[PDB]
């Protein structure tokens, strides 16, 4: 019913934005301009405890929910953009980034090009904490 008018074997590309912090994981599929979104599932929509929203298992479940529904749209290939929190906070990606990308590949989607798009300042504002840091 839906999907572009193409042959049954052609590839139609989307872009999936994977945001993985230490508190959650986002799996978000848009078109190649970013102005239109197809689906968006987060790790917090799959688990019941706050401490599991960033686990690799929750990211795996979110990705499968994305594939199981975007197949109706007619999208079957994805370019990948991954990011950490960035800015003045940490630049190391969260635990769920690895598991989310692998789940999409094993679910049937083709994988295009991969890039890291973490925000990087050329010079920054001051970050939270004192000059002594977080004393835990």
């Amino acid at each position: 019913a839906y999907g572009p008018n193409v042959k049954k074997g052609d590839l139609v590309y989307g872009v999936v934005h994977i945001f993985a912090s230490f508190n959650d994981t986002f799996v978000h599929v848009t078109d190649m301009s970013g102005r239109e979104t197809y689906v968006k599932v987060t790790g917090g929509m799959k688990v019941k405890a706050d401490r599991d929203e960033s686990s690799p298992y929750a990211a795996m479940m979110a990705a499968q929910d994305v594939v199981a529904r975007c197949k109706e749209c007619g999208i079957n290939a994805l370019h990948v953009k991954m990011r950490a929190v960035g800015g003045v906070r940490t630049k190391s990606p969260g635990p769920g980034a690895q598991a989310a990308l692998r789940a999409l590949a094993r679910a049937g989607m083709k994988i295009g090009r991969i890039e890291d798009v973490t925000p990087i300042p050329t010079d920054s504002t001051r970050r939270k904490g004192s000059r002594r840091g977080r004393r835990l």
């Binding site: 991954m82 003045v88 940490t90 630049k91 190391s92 990606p93 690895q98 990308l101 692998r102 590949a105 094993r106 989607m109 083709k110 994988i111 295009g112 090009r113 991969i114 890039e115 890291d116 970050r127 939270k128 904490g129 000059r131 002594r132 840091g133 977080r134």
Partner: protein, 103 residues
């Protein structure tokens, strides 16, 4: 009792007055840039198992075209460097060993 000849940093007596501080990569404490422990790391996005799953499903990445990596310059305060095992306390004789290149 003076423990180190360079006092734990890289500022000789008649070279500079002040070096601008930076925020610790982990806790955020301010440390002079010449004192903090710096490391340049190059990490792969995916481990060996995940990489082969992604590569087979890609018309782009394969034997000829490698996958991209992450590049980071990390600077730590002394407490965070010790707690993360980046450096460890050493016996008095061995404290003067220095390395100039990644080993």
């Amino acid at each position: 009792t003076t423990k180190r000849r360079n006092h734990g940093r890289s500022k000789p007596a008649h070279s500079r007055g002040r070096v601008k501080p930076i925020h610790c990569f982990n806790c955020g404490r301010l440390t002079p840039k010449d004192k903090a422990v710096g490391r340049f790391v190059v990490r792969r996005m995916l481990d060996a198992a995940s990489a082969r799953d992604v590569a087979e499903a890609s018309p782009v990445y394969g034997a000829n075209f490698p996958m991209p990596r992450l590049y980071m310059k990390q600077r730590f305060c002394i407490a965070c460097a010790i707690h993360s095992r980046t450096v460890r306390a050493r016996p008095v004789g061995n404290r003067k060993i220095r390395y100039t290149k990644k080993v």
